[PDB]
Amino acid sequence: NSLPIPPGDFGLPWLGETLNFLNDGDFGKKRQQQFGPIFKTRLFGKNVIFISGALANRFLFTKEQETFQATWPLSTRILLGPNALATQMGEIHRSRRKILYQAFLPRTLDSYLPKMDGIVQGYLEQWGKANEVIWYPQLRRMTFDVAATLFMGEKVSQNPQLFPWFETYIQGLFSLPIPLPNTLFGKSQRARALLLAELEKIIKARQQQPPSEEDALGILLAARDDNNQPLSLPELKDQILLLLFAGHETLTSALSSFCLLLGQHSDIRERVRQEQNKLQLSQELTAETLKKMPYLDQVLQEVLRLIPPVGGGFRELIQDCQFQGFHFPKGWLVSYQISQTHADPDLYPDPEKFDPERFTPDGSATHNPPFAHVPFGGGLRECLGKEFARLEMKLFATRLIQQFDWTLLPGQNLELVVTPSPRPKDNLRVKLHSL
Numbered sequence: 214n215s216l217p218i219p220p221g222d223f224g225l226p227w228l229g230e231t232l233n234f235l236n237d238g239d240f241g242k243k244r245q246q247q248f249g250p251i252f253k254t255r256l257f258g259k260n261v262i263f264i265s266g267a268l269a270n271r272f273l274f275t276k277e278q279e280t281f282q283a284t285w286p287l288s289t290r291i292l293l294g295p296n297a298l299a300t301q302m303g304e305i306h307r308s309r310r311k312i313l314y315q316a317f318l319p320r321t322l323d324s325y326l327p328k329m330d331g332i333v334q335g336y337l338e339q340w341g342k343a344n345e346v347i348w349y350p351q352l353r354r355m356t357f358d359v360a361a362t363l364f365m366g367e368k369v370s371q372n373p374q375l376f377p378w379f380e381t382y383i384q385g386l387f388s389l390p391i392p393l394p395n396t397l398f399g400k401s402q403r404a405r406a407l408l409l410a411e412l413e414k415i416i417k418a419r420q421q422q423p424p425s426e427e428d429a430l431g432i433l434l435a436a437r438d439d440n441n442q443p444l445s446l447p448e449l450k451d452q453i454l455l456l457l458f459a460g461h462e463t464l465t466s467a468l469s470s471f472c473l474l475l476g477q478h479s480d481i482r483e484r485v486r487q488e489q490n491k492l493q494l495s496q497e498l499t500a501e502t503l504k505k506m507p508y509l510d511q512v513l514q515e516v517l518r519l520i521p522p523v524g525g526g527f528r529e530l531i532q533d534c535q536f537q538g539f540h541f542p543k544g545w546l547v548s549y550q551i552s553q554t555h556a557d558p559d560l561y562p563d564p565e566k567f568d569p570e571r572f573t574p575d576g577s578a579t580h581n582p583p584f585a586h587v588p589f590g591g592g593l594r595e596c597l598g599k600e601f602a603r604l605e606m607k608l609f610a611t612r613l614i615q616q617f618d619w620t621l622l623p624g625q626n627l628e629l630v631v632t633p634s635p636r637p638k639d640n641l642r643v644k645l646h647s648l
């Protein structure tokens with residue numbers, strides 16, 4: 214069939230519009246205005262079509278196996294490793310998906326709580342003592358601490374080079390894949406080498422011990438493929454590195470967003486508080502207690518809606534396709550943009566406004582088309598850790614609101630940069646007031 218390809222500029226050979234993608238907060242919106250709802254570009258040497266909205270998301274998460282193959286930018290793939298779920302395909306992917314899910318079972322999450330709440334309260338106490346808190350970097354310390362603790366173990370967490378290395382590793386994930394020591398990418402390459410060497414040490418320690426499936430690392434050590442074979446060491450290291458990155462980076466964004474938004478909407482903050490008051494907290498807080506928070510549930514859906522931690526995903530077309538009148542050529546990439554979908558005014562009337570009532574029983578977002586709220590993606594690659602994320606968001610939201618009000622200091626830049634997750638430019642300057 215003789216259909217046109219989408220409008221859009223490819224730019225220079227290979228380089229294309231990669232620099233705009235990596236540096237402009239404007240990328241998708243600029244090309245939507247200039248080119249329309251479906252546009253093409255070139256990124257990291259690949260021709261890419263950007264799509265968004267319920268129907269485009271439906272398309273991308275339908276008859277997927279025969280059409281769409283998950284991928285990531287060249288820098289991301291190299292730094293994740295060939296043995297990570299994010300970089301696995303087909304039968305291997307299906308298998309590790311079932312293996313990893315066991316780390317996030319309803320009851321295993323329930324068992325994460327005590328250590329998680331202990332790490333959470335520890336930080337709140339410190340921040341409550343301070344005058345001004347520059348919050349964003351603090352949230353990064355905390356979320357790493359929770360992830361290292363719950364996925365690996367407590368003595369692992371107090372060990373002191375791990376965080377600095379991860380921070381450097383993260384900075385190169387979405388960058389120019391230039392393998393020199395004076396680039397963000399080469400520094401992340403070196404960070405990855407140092408981290409794997411440590412995780413290898415951490416793994417060899419755990420193997421000379423009675424089998425425990427308390428955490429993610431123990432779960433992976435116990436895991437067997439369909440041919441009853443263990444995961445290799447290189448796979449073990451790539452898999453924990455991913456879980457620690459995802460558990461750390463995404464949650465840093467979600468919680469700064471929550472602190473940002475409930476910072477600016479003190480009425481919503483009070484309704485959350487009113488909810489946790491019709492219960493009975495103390496320090497006594499169980500997994501079944503957090504399941505009694507329907508209104509907080511709504512706020513957290515809406516935080517993720519307004520400021521999605523993960524901007525989008527990428528797929529290679531392995532079949533030739535068409536969508537809304539365009540040829541989607543075999544071997545080109547498609548990118549689904551969660552940020553664009555969540556800013557659709559048809560899906561989200563007054564998209565710029567923070568309104569939890571969209572997720573209230575009969576609200577606008579409840580009878581939207583499928584694939585309208587996609588903070589965790591959908592189809593075959595839908596976030597595997599979503600309930601770990603929701604757990605940590607709910608506990609943090611709960612402990613923070615029960616103990617403190619807070620003020621976002623006047624004259625700061627609250628504007629959001631994405632390297633590679635939304636963060637406020639001036640790192641969220643606050644004062645907490647104890648209750």
Ligand code: HEM
Nearest residue numbers: 298299456459460463523526588589590594596597598602
């Ligand atoms: C609110 C926080 C989070 C958000 C918004 C989020 C978002 C996403 C999205 C959009 C995808 C799909 C990307 C694609 O289409 O390929 C994904 C996949 C994934 N997520 Fe999450 N994520 C979050 C937290 C977590 C956590 C806490 C973990 C566990 C440590 C995690 C682990 C993963 C993994 C391993 C994948 C790859 C799945 C696959 O390739 O099949 N994420 N996530």
Ligand SMILES: CC1=C(/C=C/C(C)=C/C=C/C(C)=C/C(=O)O)C(C)(C)CCC1
Nearest residue numbers: 285289299459463523524525631633634
């Ligand atoms: C790599 C990777 C992850 C992080 C994705 C991020 C942080 C990308 C943001 C997308 C952007 C920045 C796209 C755009 O703007 O178009 C998650 C946690 C899902 C785990 C699977 C592998």
